[PDB]
């Protein structure tokens, strides 16, 4: 503190810090000691330590029941770190722990924008298996859709089908000059290469998500129609589909040449095809057979 | 396990020496009310410790009042049971002693006069010489 | 260090040669930085040369490669991350820097037409992946190249 501290500075408590970990046991002082110097490590820039540090953090978790409530504060500190750079995941499932502070609340305000906050990062994570059911976890909360947003933001993902770009950002272009609560759109726009970064994200899940779909529903397709399907020149679909087959997350063969493009249909050229395909088909009447015939057979001993 | 040592009393009797008392007192008691220290350190707990006479005297006295001072478990030795006659099983009552040791842990277990049963097979000759370097 | 030129003048075996060079930097740790610093450049290269790129960033992550990170060793991490990446504009824009460590390649020839070989058709692993039926005019131009050569080269890929 008299210095302010530097780069340097900052170093000599680096190394001091677990010389005590191991010397002795202190339940909170120490816990408040030992987040004192990542605070200072945003100031030296320097992130790969800052990390190393937190790391030593979670071995301490679960630090509940002791205090309660200042190091569920603290958190607002990790997620500072871990949205800065390189993970949108990482904040997903802490921010539920952030979101435990305004549960003791007591508090209005901040906890009416932890629920934006906690409910906003769907898009900027990448999908997969385990976002489908943390959504779930939270949908059909009580407090939740108190947010008329939020019933946007689960049109969206209810089903699928498809929406204009334009207008999906006639309702969440308002919620800059919206509010009440301006912060989660205070992390994304503040920064104009944050916002300009996630605003291509929000365009990667719904082109992304528009996708899927289409493997579903797709035997073939138009190029030409994609293009005016997707509200983007053909050139753009390119590029996007380069990205989804590196990803192998669906099989496609798309000809540019000829205009036709698919998704899929797998060749499966004659043994599994066939096999589960005819076969379980077949036993569809064969196990259902035994299913009505006892429901007859009840029918006409009711009456007889 | 029904060895008996009087005192409590009689380790304060003993008297000489003082300072050896106080390695012995550490190297044995230390590692079971203190184990954090050593893992801190990086250093290991000794697992032995040899006491040896007689200039002068005073070995099996003072480690056996340690087995009543620091009560705990203790587990006596008498050097004569490793022959077993025929058969000489016994070093397999080794391993026996110590899966109890692992057991009831913790223990203390004294070997006296391991001379006769940790000698050195320098002349080869005669038949039990052998078994006991088994 | 020797048995690692001449094993890379020979181009038979591309595994004891990084072995050679790792024992090689063995010996000079701990007591000379100048030769310890040229021998990583090495290594990492000849890792490339066996197109493992992955592992090169595990080797240049250890505690013993941070005291030696320097310039160097950030030629060698872009090499691999252009390898992994399967870009050669990058690979190009980051040679003009580097070039100065480039220069201290014995033969600069070699590993350069080799990984230009190979990179060839880690470019064209990109664009033949998405669809089958392809015109060559139009995917020419994401590689930037004539069509002869690239016809050429497709075929050898059959080949
Ligand atoms: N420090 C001491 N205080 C009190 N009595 C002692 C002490 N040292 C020895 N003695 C006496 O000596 C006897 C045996 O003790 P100790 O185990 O030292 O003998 P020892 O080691 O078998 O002797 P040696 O090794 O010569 O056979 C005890 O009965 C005890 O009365």
């Not at chain 1, 929406?163 to 301006?182: A, I, P, Q």
């Not at chain 1, 493997?215 to 509200?231: F, G, H, P, S």
């Not at chain 1, 020149?233 to 040449?257: G, M, P, Y």
């Not at chain 2, 040791?101 to 223990?107: K, L, N, V």
Request: charged share 30%; hydrophobic share 35%; with cysteine.
């Amino acid at each position: 503190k008299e210095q302010n501290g530097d780069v340097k500075e900052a170093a000599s408590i680096l190394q001091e810090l677990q010389v005590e970990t191991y010397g002795s046991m202190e339940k909170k002082e120490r816990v408040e000691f030992i987040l004192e110097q990542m605070r200072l490590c945003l100031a030296v820039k320097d992130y790969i330590r800052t990390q190393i540090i937190s790391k030593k953090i979670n071995t301490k978790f679960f630090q509940e029941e002791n205090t309660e409530k200042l190091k569920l504060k603290y958190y607002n500190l990790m997620i500072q770190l871990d949205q800065h750079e390189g993970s949108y995941l990482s904040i997903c499932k802490h921010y539920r722990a952030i979101y435990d502070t305004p549960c003791i609340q007591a508090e209005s305000e901040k906890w009416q924008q932890a629920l934006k906050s906690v409910v906003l990062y769907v898009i900027l994570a990448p999908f997969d298996n385990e976002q489908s059911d943390l959504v779930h976890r939270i949908s059909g909360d009580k407090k939740l859709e108190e947010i008329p947003k939020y019933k946007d933001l689960l049109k969206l993902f209810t089903t699928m089908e498809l929406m204009r770009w334009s207008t999906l950002v006639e309702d969440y272009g308002m919620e800059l000059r919206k509010g009440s609560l301006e912060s989660p759109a205070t992390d994304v726009f503040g920064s104009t290469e944050e916002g300009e970064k996630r605003w291509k994200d929000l365009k990667n899940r719904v082109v992304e998500h528009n996708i899927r779909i289409m493997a579903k529903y797709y035997t073939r397709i138009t190029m030409k129609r994609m293009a005016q399907l997707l509200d983007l020149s053909v050139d753009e679909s390119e590029a996007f589909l380069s990205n989804l087959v590196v990803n192998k997350t669906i099989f496609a063969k798309v000809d540019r040449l000829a205009g036709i493009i698919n998704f899929q249909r797998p060749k499966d050229p004659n043994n599994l095809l066939n096999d589960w395909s005819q076969k379980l088909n077949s036993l569809m009447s064969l196990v259902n057979k035994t299913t009505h015939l006892i429901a007859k057979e009840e029918m006409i001993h009711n009456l007889q | 396990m029904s060895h008996e040592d009087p005192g409590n009393v009689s380790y304060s009797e003993i008297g000489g020496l003082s300072e050896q008392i106080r390695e012995l007192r550490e190297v044995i008691e230390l590692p079971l009310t203190n184990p954090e220290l050593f893992q801190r350190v990086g250093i290991i707990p000794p697992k032995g410790c040899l006491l040896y006479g007689p200039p002068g005297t005073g070995k099996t006295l003072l480690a056996r009042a340690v087995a009543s001072q620091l009560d705990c478990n203790f587990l006596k030795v008498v050097s004569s049971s490793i022959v077993d006659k025929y058969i000489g099983e016994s070093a397999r009552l080794i391993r026996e002693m110590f899966n109890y040791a692992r057991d009831h842990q913790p223990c203390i277990i004294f070997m006296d006069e391991i001379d006769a049963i940790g000698g050195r097979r320098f002349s080869e000759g005669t038949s039990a010489d052998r078994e006991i370097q088994r | 260090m020797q048995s690692g030129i001449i094993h890379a003048a020979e181009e038979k075996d591309w595994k004891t040669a990084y072995s050679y060079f790792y024992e090689a930097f063995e010996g000079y740790d701990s007591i000379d930085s100048p030769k310890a610093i040229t021998s990583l450049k090495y290594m990492l290269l000849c890792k490339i040369m066996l197109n493992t790129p992955e592992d090169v960033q595990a080797l240049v992550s250890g505690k013993l490669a941070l005291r030696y990170a320097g310039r160097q060793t950030e030629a060698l991490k872009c090499v691999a991350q252009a390898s992994k990446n399967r870009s050669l504009a990058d690979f190009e824009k980051a040679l003009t820097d580097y070039r100065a460590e480039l220069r201290d390649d014995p033969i600069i020839s070699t590993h350069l037409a080799k990984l230009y070989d190979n990179l060839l058709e880690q470019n064209l692993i990109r664009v033949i992946e998405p669809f089958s039926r392809v015109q060559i005019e139009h995917i020419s131009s994401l590689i930037k190249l004539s069509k002869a050569d690239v016809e050429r080269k497709l075929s050898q890929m059959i080949l």
